[PDB]
Design an enzyme around this catalytic site. Structure first.
Site, mmCIF file in Angstrom:
data_model
loop_
_atom_site.group_PDB
_atom_site.id
_atom_site.type_symbol
_atom_site.label_atom_id
_atom_site.label_comp_id
_atom_site.label_asym_id
_atom_site.label_seq_id
_atom_site.Cartn_x
_atom_site.Cartn_y
_atom_site.Cartn_z
ATOM 1 C CG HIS A 120 83.799 26.980 -10.720
ATOM 2 N ND1 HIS A 120 83.479 25.989 -11.627
ATOM 3 C CD2 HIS A 120 82.635 27.593 -10.407
ATOM 4 C CE1 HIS A 120 82.177 25.996 -11.838
ATOM 5 N NE2 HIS A 120 81.639 26.964 -11.115
ATOM 6 C CG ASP A 179 87.914 23.884 -10.918
ATOM 7 O OD1 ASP A 179 87.550 24.980 -11.386
ATOM 8 O OD2 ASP A 179 87.442 22.791 -11.321
ATOM 9 C CG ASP A 193 81.182 22.204 -13.237
ATOM 10 O OD1 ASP A 193 82.111 22.524 -12.461
ATOM 11 O OD2 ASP A 193 81.050 22.692 -14.376
ATOM 12 C CB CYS A 196 86.589 16.875 -21.499
ATOM 13 S SG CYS A 196 86.720 16.816 -23.281
#
Ligand SMILES: [Ca+2]
Ligand SMILES: [Ca+2]
Ligand SMILES: [Ca+2]
Ligand SMILES: [Ca+2]
Ligand SMILES: [Ca+2]
Ligand SMILES: [Ca+2]
Ligand SMILES: [Ca+2]
Ligand SMILES: [Ca+2]
Ligand SMILES: [Ca+2]
Ligand SMILES: [Ca+2]
Lengths: 655, 655
Positions: free
Chosen positions: B459, B461, B343, B635
Site C-alpha cells: 500500500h 500509505d 482498507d 486499528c
C-alpha cells in the site's frame, strides 16, 4: 528530469547516467557517525554543484573546499556527453571529523553516461527527427504533433488470401513502405556496465493494435524479425557501442473503433538487475505515441480516378453509354460481368505523412465477403455484427458523404458522412451498430443520420446526391422531388399531352399503357406521393441544418414513387438523382418518361435545370435489356476518387 | 432554423409553427397548370416575405401585388408570438392566369404558433433559465456551460437496504433535493391542433443512466411518477394551454466509467400523426444534455470533519490518545468496536450547483460489502471484478490523493489520485482493472500509479503521506526513509547508546532483546534495507515528476523494514508516515524506538523535523494492548473531510 542517486555508507556506487536527466545525490547518509564536514573531487566531464538548502554552487574538479555535513546539503550531478572507453567519470566525497584535516572515510560515485532516445516522425514530415520533445503526446491541427501509423491492410503478394496485418510476418521489403519508422538512437562506451539491459515493450492492450519489425541483413538475405506485437510484449535489445541507431518499422493492425481511440504507445527502458527473484528496475523510460490513421470516404466533388461497373455481359446499351461517358474524361473504366458494386463496397482511403493508399470497406453479410479487390496498395476492412441482424440499411447505397461544409462557423474540411435511418420512436430499420460505431470512431467525417426508412430499399442514394458547379469551388445538393414531377406532368397535360406514353420501348410495359392522364387521375397515388414529398422535405431540412445549406444550394429533380404493403416507397420510374458524377459530366439514369415531340419530357426538364450551370448530361439506359422497370436497378457503378488535398491530421474535431 | 412547408395543390394546409423556427414555403407546386402570377394575403401576426432567387421583400397583410410564378420565387413565413383562441393566423395565396385579374384558384396555410422549450440550469447557478442556447452541449471551465446531474446514491429512508437510484420509485420529497430540475415550458392556445402530440424521450443506452420524475398533487397527497428511465423510453405529455410549465426532476443512476463518458441527453419532440401503421413524424425536437458529476477524493490538507476509528473495546491507550488528539480540534470522533475502516472504505464526495454530499467508495470483496454508512446525504458506490481476482493492492490503504499541484504549467486543482502498482514487466500485483478504470473515468483527479509492490501488504500509505505547512498555503511530502533510520542509529551508537533497547513495554518482545547494536550488526538486514531505500527513491522520483515537487517539498522520516520470503518489505517498527492529519495536529504511530535518556530517539527525531514548522505531534500507541509488534497494524482511522472550494466543473481536463 531529476533522479535520486545516494552515496552508500563506506562503499562506492556505480551507476548509469542517462543524458537528459540529472542526479541529486545525498552525501550525508554515507558519512560515518561523528563526521563533521565533507570535501569532494570530480572528473572533467562531470559537473557538480553543492546545494545547501536550495542554493547551488558549482564546484571545481580538485578543490580542497569543505562544507558542513547536513541532511539539507546535497550534490547535484550533471553530465552533457556520453562516456567513451577513454572516460573515467566519477565524483568522490571525503569525510572529516572535528579534529584533523586528513579524511576519515570516502564514498564515491562512478558514472557511465549514455544517450538513449526512441525517436519517431512526430512533426509529420516523413523523416524521423532527433528526440522531438512532443513525441510522447498527440495533438490535432496545423500546429499539432505526434506520429502517425497506417493500418497495413493491403496485401503485398498474391500467394496469401489475407491482408498483410493479419499475421506476425513480413515476406516483402515493399511492405516496409507502408509502415512508420521508429529509431532507437544510443551513444555510449563499448558495453553497458554489468547488470543493465535495454528493453522495448508495449502493453497487453496494444498488442493486437501494432506490430514492430526489425530488418536484419544476414549472409543469405534480408530478413524481417517481429519484435513486438501479438503475443510478444517485450524485446531485449542488443546494445552496440559508440554512436548507434537501430531502425524499426511499425504497422497498425486495427482501425479506431468503439472502445479504441486509435492511440498506441511504445516504450524503451533501461533496466537494472537487482538480484534473483527480484524484478528488474526501470532506471529510465522513453515513450513514443502513434495515432492510427482513420478510414476516410470521398464525396462526388473529388476528382475521379476509376469507374468500376458491374452488369450482365449482354447489357449493350448500358456498357456503350458508360464507355462513351468515361471517354469524355481521363478515368479508367473497369468492368465485371448485379448491384453488389454499389451495395457491397465503399472506396475510402488512409493517409500518413510517408504514404497513403485506397481502402475498401466491405458491407456486412451475401454469405461471403468480397475480398478480391485486396492487393498491393489497395486495402480492405470490414465489420460484422456479432448479434444484430443485417438489413437493407447496411448496404452501402445507404452510405454516402457530403462535400466540405461549414456549419455554424465550424468547418468540416473532409465533409460529413451521411447514412439513412428511421425515426427514434419508430421501431424502424437502422444500419447496424457495429458499422455505425466504426464510422463514428473515424471522427474526421462527423456522421449524420438522415431518414431513409420511408423507402422500401431504404438508401440515401435513392433520394439525394451532390454535384460540383463547374468552374467554381461550390456544389449543389440534388433532391428527388415528387412535387416537381406532378407540376411538370400537369403542365404537359394542360398543353395537350395527357395521352403521352411512358416506358416507350420497354415491351414488357406496353400492355399497361401508362400515360400522363392515367398517372394524374390515380387518386391514391397522388396521396402516396404527397406523403413521400413530406419525407423528402424532412430530409431537406436535416441536410440544410447539418450541412449549412440554403435553398440557393439545392436543385429538385422530378421523381415518382409507388407505395408497398409496408407504406414504403419504390421508384415508379428510374431515380435520376443517383447518377455517376465525373466532374462536369453526369451519367444520369434514363427515366423513360412521357414522350413529347419525340423527346422524353423528364430528360428535357433535367437538362433545362443542369445545363445552364455547365453540367453536361448523358442519360444511361440500364433497363432496356430487361424490357421492363419494376423499381429495381440491375446494374451498378462505383467511382474511386482522389483523396482530399487537406490532410486529416490538420483537422481539429470536437472533444 | 428553417423548416419546409409547401402549399398543396388546390387545397389548404394546416400546420403547427414552433417559435424559434421559420418556414420556407413553395407556392409554385400548388399553382394550377397554366397559372401565370400569384398574390397573397396574410394575417396580422404572420410576417411574410417574397423571396425571389434569394432576394427577400416583406409583404403587407392585404396587398394587391402580383409576382410571376417561378420555382425560384417562394415565401418566407415568420411568427414572433404564440397563437391564442383569438388568433386566426394564416397566409392565403391567389393564382391568376394570363388574362383577367380574378383569381382562378387559391391555396392557403393555416397556422397555430406554439412555444416549446425544454430547459435546464445550463449556466450552473442552481436555477433553470429560459432556453439557454448552450443547453444542448457541455463544456468545461469557468466559461463553460451545460447542466449537471448527481448520481442519487444516498438513501432517504432507513426502511430499504438499497441506494435511492436502484429502483424506479420516489417515496420522499427530500429525494427531489438531490435531483436536477428540468422544465418543459410551453405557450399556445387551449389545445394542440388535431393530429399532434408532445413526447419526452431518451435512448435505450441512457435508460440505465437516468431517471426522470414528475410530481403530481392529487387529492390524497403528493405523488412521484417515474416518466423516463429503466424500461421507459418515452412519455406522452399532457398539454395545457396558455403559458404553462411542467417541472421534472432528474436523477443520475451511474457514475462515469469505462465506456461511459458521463454525458446523457433528454429530448422533447412535437410529433405529427400521419396515418395508421405509419410512424409519427418529429416536427420539432429540443434537446438538453446533462453531465453526471464525478466521484472526488479528499487529500490530507483539507479541513477535517469527522474522524472514524475502529479498534477493539479494550485498546484503552489508543482510544484515550485519539480522543485527546481530536479534542484539540473541532472534529467529531466516531468509534466502532480491525483495519477495515482504512482498507475497505474511501470517503469521497459529489457536487452539483444545487447540492452535494459525501459518498463512500467500497473496496471490492471480505465476503460482504460494508453498506451500513449508507444514509441521508451519505452515498455509496462500489465496483466488483467480474473475472479478475482481488489482491491486497485493492485495499484502500493503497488509494490516496495528492494536494492541488501544478506540473509543467498544468494545474491539477483537485490534486491527483495515487495508487500503488508493480513494474510493467514484473508480473507483480496491481489494483483491479475495474477500480482503476473507475478512478480514471472520474477524470478530474488524473490518477498516477506509484510502486508499492515491494511491500508485503503493498500500500502507498505504508511509505508516504502529505501534511500542510501551518500558516501557509503550502504542503510537504513525507517519505519513509531507511537511510535516515540507519544514520540516526549509527549516531546513537557512536554516542554510547548501542545497548539501548527497542520495544520497551511490549512484554511479548522482551525475550528478543532488540538493541541498536543488534540491529546495526545484522548484515543481511542492512542489505535488505539498502534495497528498500532504492524502492523508496524510485517512488520519490515519480512523485517529484508527476506532482511537480522539489527536494524543498520533502521530509524523510526514519523507517525500517524486514524482508519476507517473496523479497517484499514489512515494517520492523510501526510506520510513522501513516499518520492522522488534522490540520496542524498530527497523530503519529508510536514507533517504540530505542530509549535514550528515557525518551524514544525516533519520537525525538521526528519532533525535531516537524515541530519547527508549527506541526504539533502526538504519538498514538495502537500496539501496547497486543504486547508485541509483528509488522501488522491492528486499528484503523479514516478522516472524512470538507470538499475542495474549487468547483470541479471549472477544471479543464486533457482530451
Ligand atoms: Ca519528422
Ligand atoms: Ca504481415
Ligand atoms: Ca502492406
Ligand atoms: Ca503497400
Ligand atoms: Ca455508397
Ligand atoms: Ca441557471
Ligand atoms: Ca428511488
Ligand atoms: Ca437521495
Ligand atoms: Ca439526499
Ligand atoms: Ca485511503
Amino acid at each position: 528530469r531529476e533522479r535520486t542517486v545516494r552515496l552508500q555508507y563506506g562503499s562506492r556506487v556505480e551507476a548509469v547516467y542517462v543524458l537528459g536527466t540529472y542526479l541529486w545525490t545525498d552525501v550525508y547518509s554515507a558519512a560515518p557517525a561523528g563526521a563533521q564536514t565533507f570535501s569532494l573531487k570530480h572528473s572533467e566531464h562531470v559537473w557538480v554543484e553543492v546545494v545547501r538548502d536550495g542554493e547551488a554552487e558549482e564546484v571545481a574538479t580538485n578543490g580542497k573546499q569543505r562544507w558542513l555535513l547536513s541532511p539539507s546539503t546535497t550534490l547535484r550531478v550533471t553530465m552533457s556527453q556520453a562516456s567513451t572507453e577513454a572516460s573515467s567519470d566519477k565524483v568522490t566525497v571525503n569525510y572529516y571529523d572535528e579534529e584533523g584535516s586528513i579524511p576519515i572515510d570516502q564514498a564515491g560515485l562512478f558514472l557511465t553516461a549514455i544517450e538513449i532516445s526512441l525517436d519517431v516522425d512526430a512533426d509529420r514530415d516523413g523523416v524521423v527527427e532527433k528526440n522531438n520533445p512532443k513525441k510522447a503526446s498527440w495533438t490535432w491541427g496545423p500546429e499539432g504533433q505526434g506520429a502517425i501509423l497506417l493500418v497495413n491492410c493491403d496485401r503485398e503478394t498474391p500467394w496469401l488470401p489475407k491482408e498483410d496485418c493479419r499475421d506476425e510476418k513480413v515476406y516483402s521489403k515493399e511492405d516496409l513502405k507502408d509502415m512508420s519508422q521508429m529509431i532507437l538512437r544510443t551513444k555510449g562506451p563499448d558495453r553497458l556496465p554489468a547488470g543493465y539491459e535495454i528493453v522495448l515493450y508495449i502493453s497487453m492492450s496494444d498488442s493486437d493494435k501494432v506490430g514492430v519489425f526489425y530488418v536484419e541483413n544476414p549472409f543469405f538475405g534480408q530478413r524481417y524479425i517481429h519484435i513486438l506485437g501479438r503475443r510478444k510484449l517485450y524485446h531485449v535489445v542488443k546494445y552496440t557501442g559508440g554512436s548507434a541507431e537501430l531502425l524499426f518499422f511499425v504497422e497498425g493492425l486495427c482501425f479506431p473503433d468503439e472502445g479504441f481511440s486509435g492511440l498506441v504507445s511504445i516504450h524503451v527502458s533501461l533496466l537494472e538487475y537487482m538480484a534473483q527473484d527480484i524484478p528488474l528496475t526501470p532506471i529510465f523510460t522513453d515513450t513514443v505515441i502513434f495515432r492510427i490513421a482513420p478510414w476516410i470516404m470521398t464525396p462526388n466533388i473529388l476528382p475521379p480516378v476509376s469507374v468500376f461497373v458491374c452488369c450482365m455481359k449482354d447489357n449493350y446499351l448500358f456498357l456503350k453509354e458508360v464507355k462513351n461517358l468515361v471517354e469524355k474524361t481521363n478515368c479508367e473504366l473497369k468492368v465485371c460481368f448485379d448491384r453488389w458494386i454499389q451495395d457491397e463496397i465503399e472506396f475510402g482511403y488512409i493517409e500518413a505523412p510517408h504514404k497513403g493508399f485506397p481502402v475498401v470497406l466491405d458491407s456486412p453479410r451475401k454469405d461471403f465477403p468480397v475480398k478480391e479487390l485486396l492487393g498491393p496498395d489497395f486495402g480492405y476492412v470490414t465489420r460484422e455484427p456479432l448479434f444484430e441482424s443485417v438489413t437493407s440499411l447496411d448496404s452501402f447505397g445507404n452510405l454516402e458523404v457530403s462535400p466540405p461544409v461549414t456549419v455554424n462557423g465550424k468547418t468540416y474540411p473532409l465533409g460529413r458522412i451521411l447514412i439513412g435511418s428511421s425515426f427514434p420512436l419508430s421501431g424502424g430499420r437502422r444500419m447496424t451498430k457495429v458499422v455505425r460505431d466504426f464510422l463514428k470512431a473515424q471522427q474526421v467525417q462527423a456522421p449524420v443520420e438522415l431518414y431513409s426508412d420511408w423507402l422500401t430499399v431504404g438508401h440515401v442514394d435513392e433520394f439525394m446526391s451532390f454535384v460540383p458547379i463547374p468552374g467554381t469551388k461550390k456544389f449543389l445538393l440534388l433532391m428527388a422531388s415528387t412535387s416537381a414531377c406532378y407540376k411538370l406532368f400537369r403542365e404537359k397535360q394542360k398543353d395537350g399531352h395527357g395521352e403521352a406514353i411512358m416506358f416507350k420501348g420497354l415491351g414488357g410495359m406496353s400492355s399497361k399503357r401508362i400515360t400522363i392522364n392515367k398517372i394524374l387521375s390515380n387518386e391514391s397515388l397522388v396521396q402516396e406521393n404527397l406523403y413521400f414529398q413530406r419525407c423528402l422535405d424532412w430530409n431537406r431540412d436535416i441536410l440544410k441544418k447539418e450541412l449549412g445549406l440554403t435553398e440557393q444550394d439545392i436543385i429538385d429533380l422530378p421523381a415518382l414513387f409507388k407505395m408497398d404493403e409496408d407504406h414504403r416507397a419504390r421508384a415508379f420510374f428510374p431515380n435520376m438523382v443517383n447518377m455517376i458524377v465525373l466532374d462536369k459530366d453526369l451519367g444520369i439514369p434514363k427515366p423513360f418518361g412521357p414522350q413529347v415531340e419525340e423527346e422524353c419530357c423528364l430528360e428535357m426538364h433535367v437538362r433545362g435545370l443542369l445545363e445552364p450551370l455547365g453540367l453536361e448530361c448523358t442519360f444511361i439506359d440500364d433497363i432496356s435489356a430487361y424490357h421492363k422497370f419494376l423499381g429495381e436497378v440491375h446494374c451498378g457503378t462505383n467511382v474511386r476518387r482522389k483523396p482530399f488535398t487537406f490532410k486529416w491530421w490538420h483537422m481539429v474535431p470536437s472533444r
